[PDB]
Design a protein around this ligand. Structure first.
Ligand SMILES: Nc1ncnc2c1ncn2[C@@H]1O[C@H](COP(=O)(O)OP(=O)(O)OP(=O)(O)O)[C@@H](O)[C@H]1O
Ligand SMILES: Nc1ncnc2c1ncn2[C@@H]1O[C@H](COP(=O)(O)OP(=O)(O)OP(=O)(O)O)[C@@H](O)[C@H]1O
Lengths: 321, 321
């Protein structure tokens, strides 16, 4: 395991830089040469691959986004296109590839492993969505969660006296976890998520209570995968009067410095990915499951497509509201 | 389980308010009456016990410290003094007591359970130190961790150009966890903790490298349980020249709004404490162990006095630096 490459792919998540830092520093500590691949899979295709030194990752643990960049590379779904990527790594004697991103990003690594025996691939879960098999949490979830809390605080601090209701669109893609944790965290009366059948009427009866009971600043937190904040507002206005504050939180949820949880998590998983390459492993995603650092085959990641939504926690949040 | 009391004891930790909120709201949801005990165990002694309603805990999930207060009550180590506490609860028909605090606080609950069969007691781990058997994390640790990161950022942002070295005293009491996670999180070259034998010389050779290599802003993170920042500075100055920036972070580490992790953790543990009282349980601390919400008898909490320091993570941090 003489040389490894590392790349970041998909949307930004806080702690991607901390994961690259840990890959680079662990590899060099073990006398392995490490190459940064810039712009995700497009970088592999364009040969935008450069040797990293210890100082290349100075001042990065705190840095949001990804200093290697990321780009979309739809053409990487083509087998013939991947041959070009494989040859650019092989050219350089690279024996290991670490991909930091979401499950989409993992598919690319799985293909590279199937199509080149000589390259070992390991996935690191960098995404704010928390929707990757075999890890309880993804690198960015904790940071995203706190970003939502701060945004909701800013909204409330800047709102008018008439604001009876704030409808806040959180990210998540198809997973309700972010909306649920953020919702609980901000004391939301309602949390709208894809895993629970939304009862608009029930929700409207709940706003009209707080209001009738002379209560201000009620929060509806909405996962983008269920519906848009706008849509939620339009649907509630079928029953009750509202256009309070429809706030689409948007891409800021991916920005900002990672939290300490993300820094630590990223770091452990980046070092473990390198340990796994040195151990001869391939075609695995790393994670934290039941408080243990573990590796799961991409097959299992993508087959069992089951990481439980916590209905008990959803019901607690409602209980608390 | 008709009536319960809740109290906060020991030093502040972020999320104490969120835990009280969850106790109060869960109890009322289940048609249990709930009494707030003000000023910790002194409140029990002075009968500073008041009925809480749903609105008594509005605007609290985000609030730092503890709205019931806390006080030191050394006299609660006396059995005769505790009889007064027990009678003030018994007077009111209280059948359950929830104590939010550290292991010291738990001792008081253990005694109340031994000395009054009629009161069930449950402990919730509110402390920034992370030093309580049977939970992997305590309510406040995550918040404290991020507070340290922000303080270190402020120090670096405000420091002079000559600052080659920042010696930063973190809290923790006798546990090195905070120093370790914070140290990793800020990219500290050295982390000084009670669980590792400190080699001052080695540390001095490491500062004098960065400096000789024209490198600025090196961080030594010091657990208060190992030594003071001042002492660390005095000990290093036996070998090399330094008085850079000895910063004692202090009690601010206990202040501030809890993070989302703390809010959620507090909330789940507060609701679980109430579930346990309704189930007939007593003399247990609640926690999160291997990603499961669990309850541990006070005997085990205080006997096995073993919650592993993660040497592998300590060694990773050094690897990354
Ligand atoms: N099935 C696939 N085969 C090969 N490459 C893929 C596949 N799916 C995605 N990719 C590569 O991964 C890149 C990142 O994809 P995506 O936008 O899905 O990000 P992600 O955050 O990794 O995935 P997710 O939506 O699951 O969070 C794509 O632009 C593409 O180069
Ligand atoms: N052995 C004991 N018996 C009875 N009461 C106790 C005992 N130890 C502590 N207490 C009570 O608990 C209160 C809080 O104690 P302490 O200052 O130790 O806080 P803590 O954060 O709960 O403990 P720790 O130092 O383990 O984190 C004390 O002032 C006292 O009323």
């Amino acid at each position: 395991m003489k040389k490894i490459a590392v790349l970041t792919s998909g949307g930004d998540s806080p702690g991607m830089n901390a994961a690259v830092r840990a890959v680079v520093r662990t590899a060099i500590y073990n006398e392995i040469e490490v190459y940064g691949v810039y712009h995700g899979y497009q970088g592999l295709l364009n040969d935008d691959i450069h040797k990293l030194e210890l100082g290349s990752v100075g001042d990065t643990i705190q840095r949001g986004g990804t200093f290697l960049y990321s780009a979309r590379c739809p053409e990487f779904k083509e087998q013939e296109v991947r041959k070009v990527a494989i040859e650019n790594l092989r050219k350089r004697g690279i024996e290991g590839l670490v991909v930091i991103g979401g499950d989409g990003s993992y598919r690319g690594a799985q293909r590279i492993s199937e199509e080149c025996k000589e390259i070992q691939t390991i996935g690191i879960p960098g995404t704010i969505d928390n929707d990757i098999n075999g890890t309880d949490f993804t690198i960015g979830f904790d940071t995203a969660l706190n970003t939502i809390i701060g945004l909701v605080d800013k909204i409330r601090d800047t709102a008018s006296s008439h604001a009876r209701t704030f409808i806040i669109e959180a990210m998540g893609r198809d997973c309700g976890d972010l909306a649920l944790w953020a919702g609980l965290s901000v004391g939301a009366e309602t949390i709208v998520v894809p895993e629970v059948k939304t009862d608009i009427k029930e929700i409207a009866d709940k706003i009209e209570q707080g209001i009738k009971r002379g209560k201000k600043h009620s929060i509806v937190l909405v996962a983008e995968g269920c519906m848009t904040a706008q849509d939620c507002q339009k649907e509630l206005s079928q029953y009750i009067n509202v256009d309070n504050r429809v706030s689409v939180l948007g891409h800021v949820q991916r920005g900002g410095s990672p939290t300490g949880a993300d820094r630590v998590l990223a770091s452990r998983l980046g070092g473990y990915a390198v340990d796994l390459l040195m151990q001869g492993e391939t075609a695995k995603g790393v994670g934290i499951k039941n408080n243990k650092i573990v590796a799961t085959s991409f097959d299992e990641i993508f087959d069992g497509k089951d990481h439980k939504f916590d209905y008990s926690l959803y019901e607690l949040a409602n209980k608390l509201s």
